[PDB]
Write a structure and sequence with these properties.
Number of domains of chain B: 1
Oligomer: heterodimer
Main location (chain B): secreted
Subcellular location (chain B): Secreted
Number of strands of chain A: 14
Strand content of chain A: 35-45%
Radius of gyration of chain B: 17 Å
Number of strands of chain B: 0
Number of domains of chain A: 2
Number of helices of chain A: 0
Strand content of chain B: under 5%
CATH superfamily of the largest domain in chain A: Immunoglobulins
Structural class of chain A: mainly beta
Protein name (chain B): Somatotropin
Helix content of chain A: under 10%
Largest interface: A-B, 26 and 29 residues
Radius of gyration of chain A: 22 Å
Bound molecules: zinc ion
Shape of chain A: elongated
Disulfide bonds (chain B): 53-161, 178-185
Subunit structure (chain B): Monomer, dimer, trimer, tetramer and pentamer, disulfide-linked or non-covalently associated, in homomeric and heteromeric combinations. Can also form a complex either with GHBP or with the alpha2-macroglobulin complex.
Chain lengths: 197, 186
Amino acid sequence: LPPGKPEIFKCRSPNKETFTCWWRPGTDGTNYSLTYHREGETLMHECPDYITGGPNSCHFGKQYTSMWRTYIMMVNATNSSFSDELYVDVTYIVQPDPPLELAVEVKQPEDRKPYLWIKWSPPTLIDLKTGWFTLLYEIRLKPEKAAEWEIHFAGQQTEFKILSLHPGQKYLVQVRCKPDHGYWSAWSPATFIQIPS
Amino acid sequence: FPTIPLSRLFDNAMLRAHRLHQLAFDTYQEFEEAYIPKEQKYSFLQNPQTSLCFSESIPTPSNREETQQKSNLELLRISLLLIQSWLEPVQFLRSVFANSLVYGASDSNVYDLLKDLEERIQTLMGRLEDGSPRTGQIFKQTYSKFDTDDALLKNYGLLYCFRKDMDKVETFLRIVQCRSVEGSCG
Ligand SMILES: [Zn+2]
């Protein structure tokens, strides 16, 4: 239909075990309720936590988190009784946190030029040891002056080297991560540097 | 004769699981997007009837905890059942996968990848033997089928399921690659 009133603009699970959804009164108007029904199987269900989420949130803890199941949700907001409708599959709603300790290091090989030397580390929330995940990293570097950045895909490897680096300038560098079929992370904080001579 | 390390043996399967996983995501996004797109959306999920997948008659884990609960052999097996189970349905899906703007689709004749992956896994499985009973969960090869006239809703119904099943397979192997192949994980 044409209108609809409140929008659920997203859901994001910080690790494939819990998820939060955020709605939005697109309405120029304790008058809202969230109800969901899992895949297939017909019972309606009211939202289970409206505290851990921030206002206009419905947080699904552990008994409510189910893998490989569609979630049919719709906000029921009345004071003006309206609605909308969304299908959320948890495996594709994952968005982790930025990596830690971007350790830069400018190195110096025997006769040739100076190259950088980065190393980083995964965000906290995700525990890879018994491996529910696969992180996918990226790095960007733009020298002080510079306009747009230059992006290198580090892959499943947490270390990296960028050749052809000139004494004369100073750069910035950020690393980032994404779980295999999910969402890119925020850019970690820029660790400035200066190439030697 | 250098008896191939598990490094490669797992490493190699992970890409196959993965091509199978993207193929199904893309095409499905591709398909829902074109045929069966708006208020009609989830008619495949209409009511119980339609929605359920024949690739559900195999008891698969549904959380971290319990998916971390099935032994390396236990986990490997489901993956396989899944493969075999999707060996036929996907025959009817050629239609689907063929005019797919989504590259590799056509060229990569899906029954092949399934077939390939299928061997990779028995192998991974065998090497995780040394001979005890093959006891735990599913005993016999729980090989099912759905059917074989709403033509259009049906293809679509399948795509949803493949995507889902491609996913269970990748996710599981990854656990075993990590837990067994002590290194390239963390
Ligand atoms: Zn993948």
